[PDB]
């Protein structure tokens, strides 16, 4: 017989950082395996399609990076823009909305994220189809939609709703009675604004916060450095420099030394491409997780527990980062725990009564009904509770009284 109901909350913005794409490398394998050499190229043709299926495999990875980036960001049919006046009921998005002063019109927090993240041998790096300036129009559209229209721009066309009425809707989503917002609206606006302040302090001070995106950029750079270093190996040949073999040996002998290099460079390219195909599946599963979090957290409100960081989810704001995305997940966390005696049901005039919504609680002398997530006591009435059965059935029921709103109106 004891329930703890928290008499207060804190609103916590948690950064979640996700890889969304990787560097669109592509390698002219016929240049890497045989560089500017006719004699070597003719020998490499004896291996049939071992080259064009590697040109093909890397092209499949490169093409799907724009698929990943389009699926994550382009979840919006229109480029929504914020109003001139920022009349958002006290909430302050100015640190996550665009800065018109910049050449590429990223937000303040998008500039921190773009700061914290850091050949001749047939290797190339293809550009993304969406420039980091177009990604920043899409996150600004998702975000100007999220702020002015809530989830409704995911269901239909954006429907405007005041931000103090959009958060009141999200408080009903976590089961907190929406007057708990209005009676605390300045406190909630200030905790959101203060929690966005901590994001800048985190991201400005602590470069290791971006660890997933810098890890993805390091793995791709380490694989290319390994691939380029593997040109320097002999693989049993007299020399790793193809021109030194050709300038010294006649064809009947040069071909043998070259075949040794071809075998080694081809196996060493297949190793890179296999690693990139498995690494691209690891990023594709992260792009689909980022696309799913965009759809359920940003375009919506998630009932999934711990999907949008610790706490009951309220909303999320996407920010872009180099080859990734960042969600500033806003969550209600219940804070000041209090202790109460509690009852499964209450007995009045032989009947058993249960709360339509909330928990019967006792500070120690009186009984109240109140929502589970926020201590807000109410005098117990036929409007908060319903009758079913009688006192002789419920285990641990208590003999209180339940008030009738009609009696005094007919008594007087």
């Amino acid at each position: 017989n004891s329930i703890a109901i928290p008499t207060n909350f804190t609103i916590s913005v948690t950064t979640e950082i996700l890889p969304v794409s990787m560097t669109k490398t592509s390698v002219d394998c016929t240049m890497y395996i045989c560089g500017d050499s006719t004699e070597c190229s003719n020998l490499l043709l004896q291996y049939g399609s071992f080259c064009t299926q590697l040109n093909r495999a890397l092209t499949g990875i490169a093409v799907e990076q724009d698929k990943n980036t389009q699926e994550v960001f382009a979840q919006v049919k229109q480029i929504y823009k914020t109003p001139p006046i920022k009349d958002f009921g006290g909430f302050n998005f100015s640190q996550i909305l665009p800065d018109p002063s910049k050449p590429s019109k990223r937000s303040f927090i998008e500039d921190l994220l773009f700061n914290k993240v850091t050949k001749f041998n047939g290797l190339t790096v293809l550009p993304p189809l969406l420039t980091d300036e177009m990604i920043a129009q899409y996150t600004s559209a998702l975000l100007a939609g999220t702020i002015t229209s809530g989830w409704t721009f995911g269901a239909g066309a954006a429907l405007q709703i005041p931000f103090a009425m959009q958060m009141a809707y999200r408080f009903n989503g976590i089961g907190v009675t929406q007057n708990v917002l209005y009676e605390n609206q300045k406190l909630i606006a200030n905790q959101f604004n203060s929690a966005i302040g901590k994001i800048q302090d985190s991201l400005s001070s602590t470069a290791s916060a971006l660890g997933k995106l810098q890890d993805v950029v390091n793995q791709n750079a380490q694989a290319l450095n390994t691939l380029v270093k593997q040109l320097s190996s002999n693989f049993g040949a007299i020399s790793s420099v193809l021109n030194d073999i050709l300038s010294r040996l006649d064809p009947p002998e040069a071909e043998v030394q070259i075949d040794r290099l071809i075998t080694g460079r081809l196996q060493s390219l297949q190793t890179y491409v296999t690693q990139q195909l498995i690494r691209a599946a690891e990023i594709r599963a992260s792009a689909n997780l980022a696309a799913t979090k965009m759809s359920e957290c940003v375009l919506g409100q998630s009932k999934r527990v711990d999907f949008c960081g610790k706490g009951y989810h309220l909303m999320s704001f996407p920010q872009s980062a180099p080859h990734g995305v960042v969600f500033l997940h806003v969550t209600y966390v219940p804070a000041q725990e209090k202790n109460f005696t509690t009852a499964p049901a209450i007995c009045h005039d032989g009947k058993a009564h249960f709360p339509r919504e909330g928990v019967f609680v006792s500070n120690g002398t009186h009984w109240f009904v109140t929502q589970r997530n926020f201590y807000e006591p109410q005098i117990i009435t036929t409007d908060n509770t319903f009758v079913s059965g009688n006192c002789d059935v419920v285990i641990g029921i208590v003999n209180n009284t339940v008030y009738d709103p009609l009696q005094p109106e007919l008594d007087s």
């Binding site: 823009k81 009349d87 993304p128 899409y138 559209a141 954006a158 405007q160 005041p162």
Partner: protein, 66 residues
């Protein structure tokens, strides 16, 4: 021509390389055949291949008020 300047190679220099034969058009459209770096190409009007910066969608402000 990927990752080259329009030197060594109706010519449009993009960050994807030197694009030859496509007309550069100021009007944006939905992306059709992607080139890269924000540029897509398509066959349109008399018809020819054109290149343009792709549209991300129609612009639509929300009539937000308190």
């Amino acid at each position: 021509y990927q990752d080259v300047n329009c030197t060594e190679v109706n010519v449009f220099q993009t960050r994807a390389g030197c694009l030859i034969g496509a007309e550069h058009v100021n009007n944006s459209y939905e992306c059709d055949i992607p080139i890269g770096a924000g540029i897509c190409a398509s066959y349109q009007t008399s018809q020819s291949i054109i290149a343009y910066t792709m549209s991300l969608g129609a612009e639509n402000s929300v009539a937000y008020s308190n």
